[PDB]
Amino acid sequence: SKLKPFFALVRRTNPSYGKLAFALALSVVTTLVSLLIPLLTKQLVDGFSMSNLSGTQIGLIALVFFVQAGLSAYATYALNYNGQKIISGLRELLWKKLIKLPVSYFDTNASGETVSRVTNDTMVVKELITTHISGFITGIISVIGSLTILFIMNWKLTLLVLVVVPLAALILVPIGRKMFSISRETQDETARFTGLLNQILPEIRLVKASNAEDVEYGRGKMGISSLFKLGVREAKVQSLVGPLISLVLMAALVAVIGYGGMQVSSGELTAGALVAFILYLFQIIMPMGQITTFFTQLQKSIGATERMIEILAEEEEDTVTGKQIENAHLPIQLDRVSFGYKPDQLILKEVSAVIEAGKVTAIVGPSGGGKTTLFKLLERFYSPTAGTIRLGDEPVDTYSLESWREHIGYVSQESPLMSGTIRENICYGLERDVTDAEIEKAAEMAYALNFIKELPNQFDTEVGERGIMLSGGQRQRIAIARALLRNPSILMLDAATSSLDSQSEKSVQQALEVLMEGRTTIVIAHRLSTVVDADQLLFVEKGEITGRGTHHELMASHGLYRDFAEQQLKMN
Amino acid sequence: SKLKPFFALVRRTNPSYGKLAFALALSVVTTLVSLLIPLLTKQLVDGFSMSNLSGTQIGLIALVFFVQAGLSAYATYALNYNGQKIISGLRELLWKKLIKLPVSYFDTNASGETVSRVTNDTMVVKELITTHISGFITGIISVIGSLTILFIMNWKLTLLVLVVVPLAALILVPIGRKMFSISRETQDETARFTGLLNQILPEIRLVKASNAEDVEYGRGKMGISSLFKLGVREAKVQSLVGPLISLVLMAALVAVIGYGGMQVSSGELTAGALVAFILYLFQIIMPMGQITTFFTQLQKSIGATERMIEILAEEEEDTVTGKQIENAHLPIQLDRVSFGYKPDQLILKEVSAVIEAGKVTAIVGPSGGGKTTLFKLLERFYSPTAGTIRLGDEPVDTYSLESWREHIGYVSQESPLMSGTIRENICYGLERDVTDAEIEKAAEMAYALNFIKELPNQFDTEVGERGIMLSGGQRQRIAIARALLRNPSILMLDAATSSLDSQSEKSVQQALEVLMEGRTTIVIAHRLSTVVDADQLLFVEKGEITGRGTHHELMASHGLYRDFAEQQLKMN
Ligand SMILES: CCNc1cc2oc3c/c(=[NH+]\CC)c(C)cc-3c(-c3ccccc3C(=O)OCC)c2cc1C
Ligand SMILES: CCNc1cc2oc3c/c(=[NH+]\CC)c(C)cc-3c(-c3ccccc3C(=O)OCC)c2cc1C
């Protein structure tokens, strides 16, 4: 029942059965031919006794090794290679989700967990497929075949004295559990001691201040003493643990192998059957670890499959929206948008705003306010619940999010560089037209070409795998350039010039505002220095808009102290 | 040669040889009796042929197990418990050093490294002593005895074909190295892939904004496919590693054990000799892993001893030196004092300041310019290569200045809550609590108890481990009270945080200013609150110190063009 989702997930990558079935059958044949080795060995002993049959068999035996290896080789590869083909394409699908699926909010839950999914659960499924399931089948067949060979081989006598040994050795596991618990409490006490010293030593200043060492050291004398006491206990426990694993195992060997002594002394004709029995003893000892590891790993594998099937669900609606792109220079309206992230949690409520075409709009409010949510709903990253975004004849619901977001240029305060060469950011967003080498003039109108004219190579200027060898205030110029050179329709900025120290601020403004002041702008602001240039300001508080109009008129009308106090406190 | 420091370090805790020698002898006897076991197992097998004498001797084996384990217990216990007696004592010594030894600058180098040195490194030494050296001796004795027994037991025939097996199996180790290298490069490429996705996924806002998923997805296709390619390679390598092991070992078995078959078919009287040999086989395979682990761990253990002896070196000798501290109220003069960290990097240079019996003395300056070092220089955390400090030249530094430390009223950001209660802080002050019967009403006089009157118990009130549940100002006031209640002759203060500015600072200021109306103080807290609380200033720049009088004349002379910068920066 629970394996049906896993089988379906494997079926998602269909190139599986045709060679996987052959690989599994090949491994079964490998196990079967492996079970015939000790039978050949048991005939070889009698041949060596006399001589010539021994030479001939020593040969044949060699053969039944190499094929047993050789075939097995072509077995595991035919599995293992296919295992990668099972994983790779699977990752493919997951990637085809984890970039197409995530509407921004879905990716705001946990980026680290999501990235760890497609790098750990894939490995877990690979281990389950390539080794663990084949190991399970191989171990099951090997164990049952060895048992049946020992039944038909003897009079269920040596087999009986063998199978009795695990029954008595079952008592060994509780000793192991006791040792594990004692050891674990030992490291627990060690961690407590380490915490005590990591609390005392960093505060050595106060200890030295009042010559208190005579008592502080005293505490340490307690600490180690506790450890010592605990140590004594484990030693005593180890005194009863150490020999016991050594003891019973001795008996176990003497219980079984020496038992075969009868069979080779006077009981039966077991001279070579004894070496065959020892070979089968190794044959059965080998796969127990594999079988128990598979039985343990099955739960982790099914959990990984559950996370995969959870992630694979749902899909974005870029094409589902439609295709109604046009001049897209109409004024924007917000009407009674009332939602945050949940229907019950109303971060925003009953908001209406007007933004005229070609008019600069800025947003001011507290950090805990709805400024960020307002910005993300303007960029349509959040699906509206009840409020309406208004353009000519209500086209936003069918305004081709691909094309609508194409018309939008974006820039943020963080300005994080996408790692790689500078050519990545140079050509990013220029899809459907490489435009040849006109990028240089687009850069120079943005005042970035002259700045970057330090010019190591213009394409080998790699920001690095971590993207760290560039100033934080540097990416603003290239971001403005890339926004302007393809999408000069509407731009959105999020406090990208707060910390440029009024020197890079002027440098980036004399490009941006000079080149694109004729287009619609939406701005999230942190300072009054950038809102004076804005024709319209919107003040957010308590999840509601309470400020409309020009900076001075709104400031005198309703902004007043409600904004002076906050802005000066930020200044202070 | 290199083991001489380790032997000396063990000798530092002398309760060692008397029982360790007996434990080693008992372990050797255990090895001998274990080696004797398989010889007994042969006669019992000729006896299993005989029947009666076999039952009687099958007995004796039981005894020679219960002794073999039994004595071994009293061996390992005597080796283990007594072993702890070293480590505990060793830690003892370390603690007796790690509090007496460290002058403040010695502790400034590292804190977590030292607790690692005193816990994990002691654990390594314990693992060397209690098990690894006994493991080495046991393995050597067992291997030599097994070889000698097989020599005197099988004349150059079975032993030779046995020892040939490791010679051929030596080729396995290069295969293991190849597999390990391939696997390691596999996780390296996996880590590279994880880094790529950790670069990309957090940037999903920008990725979606420019609707470039179509190309970004391509990058993912470049990633997994590479892994797939690499995976294919390792699979091929795995195809040539898996069976080969299962070949080379298995042939080995039939190379030797099947060989023993001839010895029991027509060779000679090997019926019980075969089972004795197969049992010696495990008896010799066991200690190989132990001897290898000991050889690997010897280097780590000798490094452990090196770190131990490095830590134990040198000791702070101010404890006994010095005498005749009676008044602690004569004028103090600093003159010609210059020291940083090394004779070529003097942070401080030829400075002189006078405090006399004045009310206060405040140090002002840029961060790192000398404010932080003078605070500890006055109260002797560092011993400078500097001029004399005229307190009579502290009687030419002949005061018992370790005992003079019972004059500090150290103030800081604090939160140095050692142990876990307020009564723990009381116990911390047990230096001279012979009059502890009357100190709590002094705390009432110290104005603290009224604030502490919100007491849950006040006799066992837990401050929480690491002290993360108390207000900062609460620790401020309680520390001030605990300092002043006995030894208020000298006050140390250094404040760098102003989170709870108004209430906490005003309360502590009024309380202290009431509570040292007749004592000299040293304070470095802030620009202007400090001076309106203290009314005297000193200023340090580039090491050099200057100041004479109250704030106003210092500003008129020195602060006219320098201190306004600090005022504006702190106002920001
Ligand atoms: C005092 C002299 N002999 C000491 C002798 C010992 O003899 C052993 C022989 C063995 N071979 C014959 C079947 C095996 C497998 C384990 C043995 C143990 C042993 C017991 C418990 C855990 C580990 C071992 C151990 O060393 O690990 C082996 C997996 C053992 C242990 C000690 C301390
Ligand atoms: C392709 C089918 N799956 C496998 C089948 C295997 O057959 C093995 C059979 C013996 N067989 C008796 C004929 C031994 C000793 C190891 C075997 C190994 C083996 C090889 C290298 C290292 C460890 C083992 C292993 O499991 O550890 C034991 C040393 C092994 C491993 C796998 C994955």
- CATH number of the domain that residue B352 is part of: 3.40.50.300
| Residue among A521, A511, A498 at smallest CA distance from A450 | A511
User: Could you say which of B202, B203, B244 has the minimum Cβ distance to residue A69?
Assistant: B244
SS3 B120: helix
Domain that residue A565 falls in:
320-572
**Site of tokens 């006219």:** B560
CA triple A525-A529-A530, angle to 5 deg: 45
Cβ partners under 8 Å of residue B506, min gap 6 = none
A82: region left, alpha or beta (phi > 0 left; psi from -120 to 50 alpha): alpha
Q: In angstroms, rounded to a whole number, what is the distance separating the alpha carbons of residues A248 and A35?
A: 29
Nearest to A250 by CA among B245, B35, B441: B35
Q: For the packed helices A37-50 and A52-98, what is the interaxial angle rounded to 10 degrees?
A: 160
- Kindly report the CA angle at A92 between A86 and A97, in degrees rounded to 5? 130
Mutate to test the pocket of ligand 1, among B68, B134, B137, B286 (most ligand atoms within 8 A of CB): B286
Residue B15 phi, psi (nearest 5)? -65, 60
Which among B109, B116, B262 is the top mutation candidate for probing chain A, defined by the most A β-carbons within 10 Å of its own β-carbon? Answer: B262
**Beta pairing class for B520-524 and B538-541:** unpaired
B246 CA from centroid of ligand 2 (Å): 6
Q: Do A104 and B46 touch (CB under 8 A)?
A: no
Count CB atoms within 10 A of the CB of residue B257: 23
Q: Whose CA is nearest to atom 1 of ligand 2?
A: A76
Burial of B91 (0-12, 13-18, 19+ CB in 10 A): buried
Using the structure block, give the residue that is written with the tokens 């020999």. A243
Closest-CA residue to B79 (of B26, B29, B147, B115)? B26
Q: What tokens does A136 get?
A: 């399970």
**What is the distance, to the nearest Å, from the Cα of residue A232 to the centroid of all Cα atoms in its chain?**
44
Radius of gyration of chain A (CA): 37
Whether residues B427 and A243 touch (CB distance < 8 A) is answered with no
Cα A437-A442-A444 angle, rounded to 5 deg: 105
Structure tokens at A549: 């109009």
Interface contact flag, B238 A76, Cβ < 8 Å: yes
Q: Which residue has the tokens 């001893």?
A: B305
Q: How far is CA B288 from CA B278, B292, B295, B461, in A?
A: 16, 6, 11, 56
Tell the residue nearest (CA) to atom 4 of ligand 2: A135
Q: Ligand 2 centre and the CA of A68: distance in Å?
A: 13
Rg from Cα positions in chain B: 37
Displacement of CA B474 from its chain's centroid (Å):
32
Residue B469 CA to ligand 1 centre (angstroms)? 51
Strand partners, A354: A333
- Selected for mutation to probe chain A from B79, B228, B436 (highest A CB count within 10 Å) is B228
Domain boundary among B261, B295, B319: B319
| Integer Cα distance of A255 and A260 in angstroms | 9
Contact present, A461 and A422 (Cβ < 8 Å): yes
Q: Is the dihedral of CA B139, B141, B145, B148 positive or negative?
A: positive
User: Please, which residues have CB within 8 angstroms of residue A234's CB and are 6 or more apart in sequence?
Assistant: A182, A183, A186
Q: Are residues A291 and A330 in the same domain?
A: no
Task: Tell me the one-letter amino acid at A272.
Answer: G
Among chain B residues, CA nearest to A97 = B217
**Residue owning tokens 């290298």:** B181
> What lines the ligand 1 site, CB under 6 Å?
A 242, 245-246, 249, 253; B 27, 30-31, 72, 138, 282-283, 286, 290
Structural contact between residues B72 and B27, judged by C-beta atoms closer than 8 angstroms: yes
Residue of the CA atom closest to atom 28 of ligand 1 = B286
Q: Say if CB B487 and CB B515 are below 8 A apart.
A: no
* b/e sequence A111-140, b meaning 16+ C-beta within 10 Å: beebbebbbbbbebbbbbbbbbbbbbbbbe
Look at B224 and A272 and tell me if their CB atoms are within 8 Å: no
Please tell me the total number of residues recorded for chain B in this structure: 572
* Whether residue A190 is found in the same domain as residue A220: yes
Cβ-nearest to B118 among A50, A197, A250: A197
Instruction: Map A251-316 to HEC letters.
Output: HHHHHHHHHHHHHHHHHCCCHHHHHHHHHHHHHHHHHHHHHHHHHHHHHHHHHHHHHHHHHHCCCC
What long-range pairs does A467-474 form, CB within 8 A, spacing at least 24? A467/A416, A467/A417, A467/A418, A467/A419, A467/A420, A467/B199, A470/A417, A472/A415, A472/A499, A473/A415, A473/A499, A473/A500, A473/A504
Out of A99, A123, A405, the one facing B216 most closely (by C-beta) is A99
Spacing, Cα A247 to ligand 1 middle (Å): 9
Q: What is the resolution of this structure in A?
A: 3.9
Which of B35, B119, B415, B480 should be substituted to probe chain A, the one whose Cβ sees the most A Cβ atoms within 10 Å? B119
- Answer yes or no: do A462 and A348 share one domain: yes
Measured over the CA atoms of residue A9, residue A15, residue A20 and residue A21, the dihedral's sign is: positive
- Name residue B545's beta-bridge partners: B540
Closest ligand to C-alpha of residue A26 is: 2
**Which runs of E-coded beta strand occur in B232-320?**
none
Which single residue is written with the structure tokens 């098990």? B131
User: Which is it for strands B490-494 and B363-364: parallel, antiparallel or unpaired?
Assistant: unpaired
- One DSSP character per residue, B460-514 reads S-B--TTS-SS-HHHHHHHHHHHHHTT--SEEEEE----TTTHHHHHHHHHHHHH
Best substitution site from A136, A138, A286, A291 to test ligand 2's pocket, by max atoms within 8 Å of Cβ? A286
Counting ligands in written order, which one lies closest to the CA of residue A131? Answer: 2
Helix axes B133-153, B17-50, angle to 10 degrees: 30
Euclidean distance between CA atoms A383 and A100, whole angstroms? 16
How close B13 gets to chain A, by Cα (Å)? 15
- From the CA of B43, how far away is ligand 1's center (Å)? 24
Q: Is B548 left (phi over 0), alpha (psi -120 to 50) or beta?
A: beta
Q: Which residues pair with A361 in a beta bridge?
A: A522, A536
Q: Which technique was the structure solved with, according to the deposited record?
A: cryo-EM
- Ligand 2 centroid to B242 CA: how many Å? 7
Kindly determine whether residue A102 and residue B204, on different chains, have CB atoms separated by under 8 Å.
yes
The residue among B473, B477, B469, B362 whose CA lies nearest residue B409 is B477
Count CB neighbours of B29 within 10 A.
15
Q: Which residue has the tokens 């452990």?
A: B304
Q: Which of A13, A54, A77, A378 to mutate to test the interface with B (most CBs of B within 10 A)?
A: A77
Angle at A166 between CA A162 and CA A167, to 5 degrees: 105
- Indicate the DSSP class of residue B318: G
Structure tokens at A272: 């070579």
Closest to B554 in 3D by CA, of B569, B530, B526, B535: B535
- Torsion angle of C-alpha atoms A435, A437, A440, A446, degrees rounded to 10: 0
Ligand 2 pocket list (CB less than 6 A): A 27, 34, 72, 76, 131, 134-135, 138, 283, 286, 290; B 242, 245-246, 249-250
Tokens of B525: 């807290």
A157 alpha-carbon distance from chain centroid: 54
At B84, list the tokens. Answer: 């702890």
How far does residue A27's CA lie from ligand 1's centre (Å)? 35
The length of chain A is 572
**Do A303 and A398 lie in a common domain?**
no
Q: Reduced to 3 DSSP states, what percent helix, strand and coil does chain B have, rounded to the nearest 5? A: 65, 5, 30
For residues B130, B131, B133 and B134, what is the CA-based torsion angle, rounded to 10 degrees?
100
Beta partners for residue B429, in sequence order: none
- How many domains, in total, are found in chain A? 2
Ligand nearest to the CA of B285: 1
**Nearest CA residue ID for atom 12, ligand 2:** A283
Closest CA to B565 of B372, B351, B364, B368: B364
SS3 B546: strand
Could you give the CA distance from residue B358 to residue B548 in angstroms, rounded to a whole number?
A: 12
Whether residues B391 and B296 share a domain: the answer is no
Out of B319, B353, B372, a domain closes at B319
H runs (alpha helix) in A154-270: 158-169, 172-200, 204-209, 213-262
From A77, A102, A258, residue closest to B44, measured CB to CB:
A258
Residues A303, A368 within the same domain: no
**What are the Cα distances from residue B416, in Å, to A72, A203, B428?**
65, 6, 12
Q: Which ligand is nearest to the CA of B71?
A: 1
Q: Count Cα atoms within 13 angstroms, Cβ side, for B219.
A: 18
Q: Phi, psi at residue B413, to the nearest 5°?
A: -75, -15
How far away is chain A from the Cα of B99, in angstroms, using its nearest Cα?
6
Distance A288 CA to ligand 1 centre (A): 20
What is the spatial distance between Cα A181 and Cα A172, in angstroms, rounded to a whole number?
Answer: 15
Q: The tokens of B138 are what?
A: 């046991």
Beta bridge partners of A523: A362, A493
- Judge if B430 and B553 occupy the same domain: yes
Please work out, in degrees rounded to the nearest 5, the angle formed at the alpha carbon of residue A52 by the alpha carbons of A47 and A57.
55
CB of B361 within 8 A of CB of B524?
Answer: no
Q: Which residues pair with A255 in a beta bridge?
A: none
Do B41 and B27 belong together in one domain? yes
Q: How far is B1 from chain A (nearest CA, A)?
A: 31
Beta pairing, strands A490-494 & A408-412: parallel
Which residue has the CA at smallest separation from atom 7 of ligand 2?
A: B246
Q: DSSP 3-state assignment of A494?
A: strand
**Amino acid at site A430:** L
Nearest to B408 by CA among B386, B388, B381: B381
Q: Say how many C-beta atoms besides its own lie within 10 A of residue A41's C-beta.
A: 21
Contact (CB<8Å) B243/A95: no
B562 and B491 belong to one structural domain? yes
Distance of alpha carbon B386 from alpha carbon B335, whole angstroms: 9
B221 and B348, same domain (yes or no)? no
For residue A171, what are the CA distances in angstroms to A166, A176, A245, B272?
Answer: 9, 9, 10, 30
On chain A, the residues whose CB falls within 8 A of the CB of B399 are none
> From the alpha carbon of B285, which atom of ligand 1 is closest?
11
Please, which residues bridge with residue B524 across strands?
B494
Nearest in space to B205 (alpha carbons), one of A408, A475, A331:
A408
Whether B34 contacts A253, CB under 8 Å: no
Q: Are the beta carbons of B201 and A379 separated by less than 8 Å?
A: no
Nearest to A90 by CA among B231, B570, B134: B231
DSSP B18-69: HHHHHHHHHHHHHHHHHHHHHHHHHHHHHHHHHSHHHHHHHHHHHHHHHHHH
- For the stretch A141-146, contacts whose Cβ atoms lie closer than 8 Å and that sit 24 or more positions apart, written own/partner, are A141/A28, A141/A31, A141/A32, A142/A31, A142/A34, A142/A35, A142/A283, A142/A284, A142/A286, A142/A287, A143/A284, A143/A287, A143/A288, A143/A291, A145/A31, A145/A32, A145/A35, A146/A35, A146/A280, A146/A283, A146/A284
What is the number of the ligand closest to the CA of A78?
2
Bridge partners, B523 (sequence order): B362, B493
Q: Which helix (H) or strand (E) holds A412?
A: strand A408-412
Closest CA to B101 of A206, A196, A208: A208
If asked whether residues A31 and A54 sit together in one domain, one would say yes
Domain boundary among A303, A319, A335: A319
Mark whether B145 and B264 lie in a shared domain: yes
Rounded distance between C-alpha atoms, residue A400 and residue A121, angstroms: 35
Q: Do A231 and B84 touch (CB under 8 A)?
A: yes
Our CA dihedral for B380, B383, B384, B389, rounded to 10 degrees, sits at 50
